[PDB]
Design a binder for this molecule. Structure first.
Ligand code: ZN
Length: 194
């Protein structure tokens, strides 16, 4: 089937935020508010912020999953291409087929859905620090959008879900993603078409 991608702030006022990085040649990750699209480099740190109005109960978890944006590819599971799947970039935690990984969190958990076969990565939800207003999760995309045999130029969306310790849905948000070599340039160019 196909995972829901409907925005749902829920009772905790769950929202996503991103760094305002700009489009200079040096940027490794930059978000476009106009396109609700993230442009980032392969395996590089991609900061995604979790903003809430109320602190979720203990045991709450955060899940990330990718799905193809185009309706004619939506049913196809998003996974790494043969090359990167076989490439030796393993961190010892993430399965080799998974596109999305989380770095700097030893409590990260990966899942191959037994029924839908969709891949996803989840971490415990942690309240914002003192003086801090949001929680930051560092994601890494282990395949380029252009990868032959993988996404193969097909656009993807990343769906972030907030769930309780039992898996019940608490909140949902999403954004488009493009993994490329020059995020800044690519973002600036796609926004010109506006
Ligand atoms: Zn690849």
């Amino acid at each position: 089937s196909v995972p829901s991608q409907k925005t749902y702030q829920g009772s905790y006022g769950f929202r996503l935020g991103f760094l305002h990085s700009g489009t200079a040649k040096s940027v490794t990750c930059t978000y476009s508010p106009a396109l609700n699209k993230m442009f980032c480099q392969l395996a590089k740190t991609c900061p995604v912020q979790l903003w809430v109005d109320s602190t979720p109960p203990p045991g709450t978890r955060v899940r990330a999953m990718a799905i193809y944006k185009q309706s004619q590819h939506m049913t196809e599971v998003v996974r790494r291409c043969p090359h990167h799947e076989r490439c030796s970039d393993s961190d010892g935690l993430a399965p080799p087929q998974h596109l999305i990984r989380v770095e700097g969190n030893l409590r990260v958990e990966y899942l191959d859905d037994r029924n839908t076969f969709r891949h996803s990565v989840v971490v415990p939800y942690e309240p914002p620090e003192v003086g801090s207003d949001c929680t930051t999760i560092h994601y890494n995309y282990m395949c380029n959008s252009s990868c032959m045999g993988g996404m193969n130029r097909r656009p993807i969306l990343t769906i972030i879900t907030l769930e309780d310790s039992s898996g019940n849905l608490l909140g949902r948000n999403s954004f488009e993603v493009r993994v490329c070599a020059c995020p800044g340039r690519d973002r600036r160019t796609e926004e010109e078409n506006l």
